[PDB]
Design a protein around this motif. Structure first.
Motif, PDB file in Angstrom:
ATOM      1  N   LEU A  57     -32.492 -61.704  68.969  1.00 46.41           N
ATOM      2  CA  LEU A  57     -34.003 -60.735  68.653  1.00 46.41           C
ATOM      3  C   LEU A  57     -34.934 -61.478  67.861  1.00 46.41           C
ATOM      4  O   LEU A  57     -35.832 -61.538  67.878  1.00 46.41           O
ATOM      5  N   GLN A  58     -34.438 -62.552  66.234  1.00 44.64           N
ATOM      6  CA  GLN A  58     -35.407 -63.168  65.580  1.00 44.64           C
ATOM      7  C   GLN A  58     -35.702 -64.166  66.500  1.00 44.64           C
ATOM      8  O   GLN A  58     -36.940 -64.222  66.671  1.00 44.64           O
ATOM      9  N   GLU A  59     -35.409 -65.002  67.528  1.00 44.99           N
ATOM     10  CA  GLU A  59     -35.391 -66.230  68.041  1.00 44.99           C
ATOM     11  C   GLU A  59     -36.435 -65.590  68.813  1.00 44.99           C
ATOM     12  O   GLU A  59     -37.924 -66.502  69.013  1.00 44.99           O
ATOM     13  N   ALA A  60     -36.502 -64.343  70.378  1.00 45.43           N
ATOM     14  CA  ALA A  60     -37.104 -64.294  70.612  1.00 45.43           C
ATOM     15  C   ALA A  60     -38.566 -63.607  70.276  1.00 45.43           C
ATOM     16  O   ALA A  60     -39.787 -63.819  71.089  1.00 45.43           O
ATOM     17  N   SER A  61     -38.988 -63.301  68.934  1.00 47.50           N
ATOM     18  CA  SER A  61     -39.509 -62.441  68.119  1.00 47.50           C
ATOM     19  C   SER A  61     -40.784 -63.989  67.835  1.00 47.50           C
ATOM     20  O   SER A  61     -41.754 -63.171  68.080  1.00 47.50           O
ATOM     21  N   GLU A  62     -40.014 -64.090  66.992  1.00 46.86           N
ATOM     22  CA  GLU A  62     -40.494 -64.838  67.068  1.00 46.86           C
ATOM     23  C   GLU A  62     -41.902 -66.272  67.795  1.00 46.86           C
ATOM     24  O   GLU A  62     -42.834 -66.844  68.060  1.00 46.86           O
ATOM     25  N   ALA A  63     -40.945 -66.964  69.081  1.00 43.89           N
ATOM     26  CA  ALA A  63     -41.260 -67.589  70.088  1.00 43.89           C
ATOM     27  C   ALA A  63     -42.268 -66.579  70.567  1.00 43.89           C
ATOM     28  O   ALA A  63     -43.619 -67.360  70.980  1.00 43.89           O
ATOM     29  N   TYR A  64     -41.996 -65.082  70.670  1.00 44.22           N
ATOM     30  CA  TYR A  64     -43.615 -64.607  71.466  1.00 44.22           C
ATOM     31  C   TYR A  64     -44.535 -64.887  70.175  1.00 44.22           C
ATOM     32  O   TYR A  64     -45.726 -64.949  71.207  1.00 44.22           O
ATOM     33  N   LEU A  65     -44.296 -64.314  69.225  1.00 40.58           N
ATOM     34  CA  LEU A  65     -45.730 -64.168  68.560  1.00 40.58           C
ATOM     35  C   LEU A  65     -46.156 -65.394  68.113  1.00 40.58           C
ATOM     36  O   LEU A  65     -47.600 -65.278  68.120  1.00 40.58           O
ATOM     37  N   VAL A  66     -45.587 -66.170  67.990  1.00 42.73           N
ATOM     38  CA  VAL A  66     -46.083 -67.963  67.848  1.00 42.73           C
ATOM     39  C   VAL A  66     -46.941 -68.548  68.720  1.00 42.73           C
ATOM     40  O   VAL A  66     -48.361 -68.670  69.168  1.00 42.73           O
ATOM     41  N   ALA A  67     -46.580 -68.094  70.374  1.00 44.99           N
ATOM     42  CA  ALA A  67     -47.514 -67.758  71.615  1.00 44.99           C
ATOM     43  C   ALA A  67     -48.722 -66.868  71.663  1.00 44.99           C
ATOM     44  O   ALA A  67     -49.186 -67.618  72.265  1.00 44.99           O
ATOM     45  N   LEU A  68     -47.659 -65.689  71.219  1.00 45.76           N
ATOM     46  CA  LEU A  68     -49.404 -64.697  70.207  1.00 45.76           C
ATOM     47  C   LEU A  68     -50.577 -65.509  70.209  1.00 45.76           C
ATOM     48  O   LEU A  68     -51.644 -65.637  70.572  1.00 45.76           O
ATOM     49  N   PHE A  69     -50.046 -65.971  69.507  1.00 49.71           N
ATOM     50  CA  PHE A  69     -51.374 -67.199  67.945  1.00 49.71           C
ATOM     51  C   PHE A  69     -51.592 -67.619  68.942  1.00 49.71           C
ATOM     52  O   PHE A  69     -53.370 -67.855  68.445  1.00 49.71           O
ATOM     53  N   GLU A  70     -51.149 -68.371  69.463  1.00 50.43           N
ATOM     54  CA  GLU A  70     -52.080 -69.160  70.592  1.00 50.43           C
ATOM     55  C   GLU A  70     -52.963 -69.328  71.272  1.00 50.43           C
ATOM     56  O   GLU A  70     -54.430 -69.324  71.021  1.00 50.43           O
ATOM     57  N   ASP A  71     -52.849 -68.052  72.435  1.00 50.35           N
ATOM     58  CA  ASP A  71     -53.684 -67.257  73.363  1.00 50.35           C
ATOM     59  C   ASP A  71     -54.566 -67.129  72.634  1.00 50.35           C
ATOM     60  O   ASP A  71     -55.960 -66.378  73.010  1.00 50.35           O
ATOM     61  N   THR A  72     -54.343 -66.117  71.056  1.00 51.90           N
ATOM     62  CA  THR A  72     -55.477 -65.341  69.865  1.00 51.90           C
ATOM     63  C   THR A  72     -56.493 -65.950  69.642  1.00 51.90           C
ATOM     64  O   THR A  72     -57.509 -66.104  69.168  1.00 51.90           O
ATOM     65  N   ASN A  73     -56.111 -67.764  69.314  1.00 58.29           N
ATOM     66  CA  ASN A  73     -56.383 -68.678  68.998  1.00 58.29           C
ATOM     67  C   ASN A  73     -57.736 -69.392  70.001  1.00 58.29           C
ATOM     68  O   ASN A  73     -59.212 -69.620  69.401  1.00 58.29           O
ATOM     69  N   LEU A  74     -57.298 -68.835  70.756  1.00 57.37           N
ATOM     70  CA  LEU A  74     -58.214 -69.346  72.360  1.00 57.37           C
ATOM     71  C   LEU A  74     -59.276 -68.608  72.159  1.00 57.37           C
ATOM     72  O   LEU A  74     -60.332 -68.656  72.932  1.00 57.37           O
ATOM     73  N   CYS A  75     -58.902 -67.632  72.004  1.00 59.68           N
ATOM     74  CA  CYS A  75     -59.855 -66.533  71.916  1.00 59.68           C
ATOM     75  C   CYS A  75     -60.969 -66.300  70.948  1.00 59.68           C
ATOM     76  O   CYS A  75     -62.302 -66.193  71.691  1.00 59.68           O
ATOM     77  N   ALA A  76     -60.422 -66.653  69.939  1.00 60.95           N
ATOM     78  CA  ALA A  76     -61.639 -66.638  68.813  1.00 60.95           C
ATOM     79  C   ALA A  76     -62.481 -68.355  68.877  1.00 60.95           C
ATOM     80  O   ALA A  76     -63.507 -68.611  68.814  1.00 60.95           O
ATOM     81  N   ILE A  77     -61.519 -69.375  69.386  1.00 59.43           N
ATOM     82  CA  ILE A  77     -62.716 -70.179  70.018  1.00 59.43           C
ATOM     83  C   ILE A  77     -63.686 -70.072  70.612  1.00 59.43           C
ATOM     84  O   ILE A  77     -64.928 -70.864  70.882  1.00 59.43           O
TER      85      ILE A  77
END
Lengths: 100, 80, 95, 107, 95, 103, 86, 103
Positions: A57-77
DNA sequence: GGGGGGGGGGGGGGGGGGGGGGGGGGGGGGGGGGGGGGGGGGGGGGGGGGGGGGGGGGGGGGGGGGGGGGGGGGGGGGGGG
DNA sequence: CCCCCCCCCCCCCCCCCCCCCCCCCCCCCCCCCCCCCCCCCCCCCCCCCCCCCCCCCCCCCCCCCCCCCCCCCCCCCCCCCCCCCCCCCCCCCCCCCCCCCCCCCCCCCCCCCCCCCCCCCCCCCCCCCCCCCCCCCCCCCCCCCCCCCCCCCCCCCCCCCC
């Protein structure tokens, strides 16, 4: 006395490099284990967990939040900023079809 | 201290860095927590449903792995 | 204690022909095994859907083949098909 | 004896793959003689393709064992495998990358 | 042969019970027919795996129920489960 | 002779659903007596839920027959049905909506 | 016994049709470059779908692409369609 | 003036009128024959001599317009996030990167 | 431009968790040969549906022009990481 | 002594009065075609009823492993100072929307023939099943070896500040 200060944004870039280099988990373990057990308690009481289960569960969550931060950054940029804001996380989840 | 707050700014900040993020607004921390709560609710709910059906009281790695797969979030490295 | 089948020893053999002097960690082997199980499942699944669409009962190498063309991206598919025809041939011609 | 797998020139277990195919079947269905061979050659091939790239990723790091990180490097680094393998690789991290506009000081 | 099974007569029955004076165009019935097939393929699928994961070969009403809890959103699940339960209990009350 | 549907108090075909489960079996697969009954009830219930809402919409439009457009207003309109039904509904168009910043 | 060569049919998705599609999608103002971008995105989408549909057709040794072929191809790619099959 | 200034809607007024109109209807918005040729042309470049049931072509058209319309809603969210009301190629690209597609 | 203070890198080293090599087992696969049964391919056969060809007419499309609008850029400020 | 009393500056805020030609829009209305709607069998198809397995549950037995605890170790939160960054406003030019005009290609309606595909019927190569033989892979237990990875030392380079 010793007056040495890095400019805002320099340590931050150093952190990005360090953390993209490594693979360890980044959320402290017990706190995450507690969160998991509490969320589970509302679906069924007296539950126990294999250790490998909490880890998956921890491996899945962190991969999910990290990937969500990548898309989030793309939206800020996209909006010409360098600072992520809640509306960027929201735009990113909205387009992913997750809505919330 | 509520459990969800055990997921701290520093940990949230490290996840963002691995995500290549440079500067973080202050409101991001509560938002990330809500997002993680929802993700974990969706997955645990499915894991526990597999547990009950198997008549056990121990959520297993496989129950989590089958739950993740069901949601299009396949994970490798923990069986299955 | 009941036997859990795994693809580990076959993954290790394939590893040896590919990089005779390289090893593979436990966590890495677990990942490869998940990868092999996942791909076989997507393939048998498409192949039996193919069989059903065509009102047939046999999963033949021809369904496995169309399934590979549906599942793999261009080059990967080109070579994979090629590897498949080549094993069947060598096997058809034997005793 | 010889053995289906040896007979086909493969390392992957033809007999086992065959058995498994008889269980992913339509109630009363059958499996062709060669279907297992073909499947086994397809799995063998992809396994080789990933080990080959993961194996290079570890040699270019002057290390002997392929790790999850090496598997993540090899997969996200190849357009076709990246596309085929959407699973999260536990312990693999991400490919390093900083957006040009964040890297700066500018002038 | 040529005869193709459809769920349309059954959808009409249900429509008459909820909206006695309402009809359904053929396009609309086509969509309802696809919707029903889709949901059934999804439930049988989850029930099979579910059985598989538990080393069981029999698909019972218990697998169907769990399949339903995994597939439907919160409230739809509760009402569906209660209607499933009701129909099993009644069915077995005759045998 | 009472049909299995009638015996279960359902409009959806139990015998047929039982047949379809036996053929998606999986080799030595068995299908329990009541699996098809429970299945026909879930199917009949979902169908009932979608028609109830489509029928309300064909009615607020002073019309008698449900169209794909009504099925689409009903489904996109309900949080749970919307979540469960991702399929594209041919001929259903979309739910009218214009962003406040465009007005 | 004859012919006709198909070329540049992507220009058949005209600027007015693209504007209609954008209006239904709620778009109010459209820059001049959107049109060639939309054509490129539609070409890729259709290529991916037609490629799978034709693969089912050939597998079945038919020469006619059926609505079912399209429907299974749309399904494999996660784009289920209701109204022909699913 | 004489017959004075011939009436003219301000930029944006007819565009809003258009969104209201197309959002409430369900017809196919791309002309049929040109879309059929595009289909035949792409198919032909994969395998020559193919025929098409007319409903196969209709299925591809419904799928395509449903895909474009949903992509323009996402593209419209990216433009507005950027404080614009005009969609641009970069908005479409952002929507597809986040959706996990590419080309 | 220089210093001043840091981080970072490179090469080298060491212990220890991890990995491996070994022997041993045994119920369970794996393979064999023989027998029997079954899925399916061909081969008509007939019917159904798909291009194709024809013609007529109006809505759709394109092009053009003009003006209003909107996007981009620049600057500044207070404020927030 | 900074805040306090000025100071003027953009910012809004009624105020004037219609519009006004499309823009829907809503009611009505009417052909029309498709949607039922009986008929018409009819292969299907689902129910029953013995007859015979059979798999799953369930209690029991087993026994790794989960939680819990203690002892030992470490990440977090913090208040603060600083500077950049996001935001806001203004300015300006370019670009795209509205409208007009003319045109034509998509549509609609018909048919029609020919491909081609499905359906059936016939036939048979192919797969399964079975029993026997055999090998055999996962596991346990073992247990020597080893690749790694953190650590260290020394040096180089970069960044910030002066």
């Amino acid at each position: 006395k010793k007056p040495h200060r890095y400019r805002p944004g320099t340590v931050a870039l150093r952190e990005i490099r360090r953390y993209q280099k490594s693979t360890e988990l980044l959320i402290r373990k017990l706190p995450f284990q507690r969160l998991v057990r509490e969320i589970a308690q509302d679906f069924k009481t007296d539950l126990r967990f294999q250790s490998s289960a909490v880890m998956a569960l921890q491996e899945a969550s962190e991969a999910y939040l990290v990937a969500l931060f990548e898309d989030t950054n793309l939206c800020a940029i996209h909006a010409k900023r360098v600072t992520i804001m809640p509306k960027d996380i929201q735009l990113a989840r909205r387009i992913r079809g997750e809505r919330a | 201290r509520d459990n969800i707050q055990g997921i701290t700014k520093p940990a949230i900040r490290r996840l963002a860095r691995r995500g290549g993020v440079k500067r973080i607004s202050g409101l991001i921390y509560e938002e990330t927590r809500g997002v993680l709560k929802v993700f974990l609710e969706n997955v645990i709910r499915d894991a526990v449903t597999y547990t009950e059906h198997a008549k056990r009281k121990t959520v297993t790695a496989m129950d989590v792995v089958y739950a993740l797969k069901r949601q299009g979030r396949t994970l490798y490295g923990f069986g299955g | 204690k009941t036997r859990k089948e795994s693809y580990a020893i076959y993954v290790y053999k394939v590893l040896k022909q590919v990089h005779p002097d390289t090893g593979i960690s436990s966590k890495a082997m677990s990942i490869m095994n998940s990868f092999v199980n996942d791909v076989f499942e997507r393939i048998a699944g498409e192949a039996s859907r193919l069989a059903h669409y065509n009102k047939r009962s046999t999963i033949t190498s021809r369904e496995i083949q169309t399934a590979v063309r549906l599942l793999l991206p261009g080059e990967l598919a080109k070579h994979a098909v090629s590897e498949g025809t080549k094993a069947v041939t060598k096997y058809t011609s034997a005793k | 004896a010889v053995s289906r797998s040896q007979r086909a020139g493969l390392q992957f277990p033809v007999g086992r793959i065959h058995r498994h195919l008889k269980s992913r079947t339509t109630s009363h269905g059958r499996v062709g003689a060669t279907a297992a061979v073909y499947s086994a050659a397809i799995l063998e091939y992809l396994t080789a393709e990933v080990l080959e790239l993961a194996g290079n990723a570890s040699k270019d790091l002057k290390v002997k064992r392929i790790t999850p990180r090496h598997l993540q490097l090899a997969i996200r680094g190849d357009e076709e495998l990246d596309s085929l393998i959407k699973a999260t690789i536990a312990g693999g991290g991400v490919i390093p990358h900083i957006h040009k506009s964040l890297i700066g000081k500018k002038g």
